[PDB]
Amino acid sequence: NPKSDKFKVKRFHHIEFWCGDATNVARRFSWGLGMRFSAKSDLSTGNMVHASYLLTSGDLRFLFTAPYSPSLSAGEIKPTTTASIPSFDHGSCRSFFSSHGLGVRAVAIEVEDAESAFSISVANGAIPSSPPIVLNEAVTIAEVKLYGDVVLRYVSYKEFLPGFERVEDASSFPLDYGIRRLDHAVGNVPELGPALTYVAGFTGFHQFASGLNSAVLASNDEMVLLPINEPVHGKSQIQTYLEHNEGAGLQHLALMSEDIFRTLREMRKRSSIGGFDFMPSPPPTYYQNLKKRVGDVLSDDQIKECEELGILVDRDDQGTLLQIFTKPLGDRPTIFIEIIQRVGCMQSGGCGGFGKGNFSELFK
Amino acid sequence: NPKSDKFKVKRFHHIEFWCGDATNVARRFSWGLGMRFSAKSDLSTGNMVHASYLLTSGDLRFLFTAPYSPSLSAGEIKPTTTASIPSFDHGSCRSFFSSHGLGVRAVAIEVEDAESAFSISVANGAIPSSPPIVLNEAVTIAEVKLYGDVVLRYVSYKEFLPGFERVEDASSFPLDYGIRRLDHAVGNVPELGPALTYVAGFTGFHQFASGLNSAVLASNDEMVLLPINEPVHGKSQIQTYLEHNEGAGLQHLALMSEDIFRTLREMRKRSSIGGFDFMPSPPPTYYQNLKKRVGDVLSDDQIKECEELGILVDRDDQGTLLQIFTKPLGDRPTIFIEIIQRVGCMQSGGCGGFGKGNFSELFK
Ligand SMILES: COc1ccc(-c2c(S(C)(=O)=O)ccc(C(=O)c3cnn(C(C)(C)C)c3O)c2C)cc1
Ligand SMILES: COc1ccc(-c2c(S(C)(=O)=O)ccc(C(=O)c3cnn(C(C)(C)C)c3O)c2C)cc1
Ligand SMILES: [Fe+3]
Ligand SMILES: [Fe+3]
Contact A244 B69 (CB under 8 A): yes
With CA atoms as reference, report the closest residue to A155 among A224, A216, A93.
Answer: A224
With CA atoms as reference, report the closest residue to B269 among B33, B74, B13.
Answer: B33
Q: Give φ, ψ of A350 to 5 degrees.
A: 75, 15
CA atoms of B83 and A249, how far apart (whole Å): 26
Chain centre distance of CA A102: 13
Taking CA atoms, what residue in B is nearest to A92?
B98
Per DSSP bridges, beta strands A249-257 and A179-188 are antiparallel
Same domain, A279 and A316: yes
Same domain, B124 and B196: no
Provide the phi-psi class of B99: left if phi over 0, else alpha when psi is between -120 and 50, else beta: alpha
* CA distances, A229 to each of A101, A191, A251, B57 (Å): 20, 8, 9, 43
* DSSP helix/strand/coil, A328: coil
Round to the nearest angstrom and report the end-to-end CA distance of chain B: 33
Rg, chain B, Cα only: 20
Q: Last residue of some domain: A176, A196, A230? A: A176
Q: Which residues contact A75 (CB under 8 A, 6 or more apart)?
A: none
Same domain, A103 and A113: yes
Tell which A residues from 35 to 74 touch B, by Cβ distance under 8 Å: 37, 42-43, 51, 66, 68-69, 71-72
With CA atoms as reference, report the closest residue to A55 among B271, B109, B273.
Answer: B273
Same domain, B217 and B141: no
* CA distances, A136 to each of A129, A163, A254 (Å): 21, 8, 32
What is the side-by-side order of every strand in the sheet holding A9-18?
A128-135, A139-147, A150-157, A103-111, A9-18, A60-67, A50-57, A36-41, A165-166
The helix or strand, by DSSP H or E, that contains position A272, with its residue range, turns out to be: none
Same domain, A196 and A123: no
Q: Å from A160 to nearest chain B CA?
A: 20
Find the B179 Cα to ligand 4 centroid distance in Å.
15
Chain centre distance of CA B173: 23
Q: Which residues contact B41 (CB under 8 A, 6 or more apart)?
A: B47, B50, B51, B52, B84, B85, B161, B163, B164, B165
Same domain, A22 and A123: yes
Amino acid making up residue A179: I
Question: Among all ligands shown, which has an atom nearest to the Cα of A255?
Answer: 3
CA atoms of B339 and B322, how far apart (whole Å): 8
Contact B274 A27 (CB under 8 A): yes
- Which CATH number characterizes residue A361's domain? 3.10.180.10
Same domain, A41 and A136: yes
Spell out where chain A is interrupted, by the residue before each break (C to N > 2.5 A). 158, 209, 234, 346
Identify all chain A residues contacting B19, using CB atoms and an 8 Å cutoff: 20-21
Same domain, B160 and B181: no
Find the B199 Cα to ligand 2 centroid distance in Å.
21
CA atoms of A117 and A155, how far apart (whole Å): 9
Ligand 2 in contact with B334 (CB < 6 A)? Answer: no
Same domain, A214 and A70: no
With CA atoms as reference, report the closest residue to B340 among B272, B252, B275.
Answer: B252
Question: Among all ligands shown, which has an atom nearest to the Cα of A326?
Answer: 1
CA atoms of B302 and B306, how far apart (whole Å): 6
Ligand 1 in contact with A349 (CB < 6 A)? Answer: no
CA atoms of A17 and A10, how far apart (whole Å): 22
CA A322, A324, A325: angle at the middle one, nearest 5?
A: 150
* CA distances, B109 to each of B61, B181, B206 (Å): 11, 13, 16
With CA atoms as reference, report the closest residue to B190 among B151, B147, B156, B222.
Answer: B147
Find the A175 Cα to ligand 2 centroid distance in Å.
33
CA atoms of A15 and A109, how far apart (whole Å): 9
Q: Give φ, ψ of A178 to 5 degrees.
A: 110, -10
Amino acid making up residue B79: P
Residue B332 at interface with chain A, using a CB cutoff of 8 Å: yes
Method: X-ray
CA atoms of A228 and B62, how far apart (whole Å): 39
Find the A324 Cα to ligand 1 centroid distance in Å.
9
* DSSP helix/strand/coil, A185: strand
Taking CA atoms, what residue in A is nearest to B41?
A331
Amino acid making up residue A181: R
Ligand 2 in contact with B166 (CB < 6 A)? Answer: no
Identify all chain A residues contacting B102, using CB atoms and an 8 Å cutoff: 20-21, 24
Per DSSP bridges, beta strands A50-57 and B206-207 are unpaired
Identify all chain B residues contacting A72, using CB atoms and an 8 Å cutoff: 243-244
CA A7, A17, A322: angle at the middle one, nearest 5?
A: 75
Contact A332 B22 (CB under 8 A): no
Ligand 2 in contact with B52 (CB < 6 A)? Answer: no
Q: Are A37 and A30 in contact (CB under 8 A)?
A: yes
Contact A175 B273 (CB under 8 A): yes
CA atoms of B232 and A264, how far apart (whole Å): 53
Number of domains in chain A: 2
DSSP letter for A105, please.
E
CA atoms of B351 and B345, how far apart (whole Å): 6
Same domain, B130 and B216: no
Contact A331 B66 (CB under 8 A): yes
With CA atoms as reference, report the closest residue to B68 among B22, B136, B129, B133.
Answer: B22
* CA distances, A280 to each of A89, A311, A337, A362 (Å): 39, 10, 14, 11
Residue A333 at interface with chain B, using a CB cutoff of 8 Å: yes
Same domain, A171 and A315: no
Give the residue numbers spanning the domain of B249: 177-364
Q: Which residues contact A292 (CB under 8 A, 6 or more apart)?
A: none
CA atoms of A130 and A115, how far apart (whole Å): 11
CA A99, A28, A103: angle at the middle one, nearest 5?
A: 20
Q: Give φ, ψ of A225 to 5 degrees.
A: -125, 120
CA atoms of A90 and A93, how far apart (whole Å): 5
CA atoms of A356 and A323, how far apart (whole Å): 11
Q: Which residues contact A296 (CB under 8 A, 6 or more apart)?
A: none
Q: Last residue of some domain: B135, B151, B176? A: B176
CA atoms of B201 and B132, how far apart (whole Å): 20
Residue A82's Cβ-count burial label (10 Å; 0-12, 13-18, 19+) is middle
Q: For residues B8-26, b (16+ Cβ closer than 10 Å) or e, as one string?
A: ebbebbbbbbbbbbbbbbb
Per DSSP bridges, beta strands A179-188 and A225-231 are parallel
Same domain, B227 and B352: yes
* CA distances, B306 to each of B277, B298, B343, B353 (Å): 17, 10, 14, 18
Q: Last residue of some domain: A159, A176, A193? A: A176
Binding-site residues of B for Fe cation, please?
Answer: 184, 252, 338
Look at ligand 1, atom 27, and give the residue with the nearest C-alpha: A354
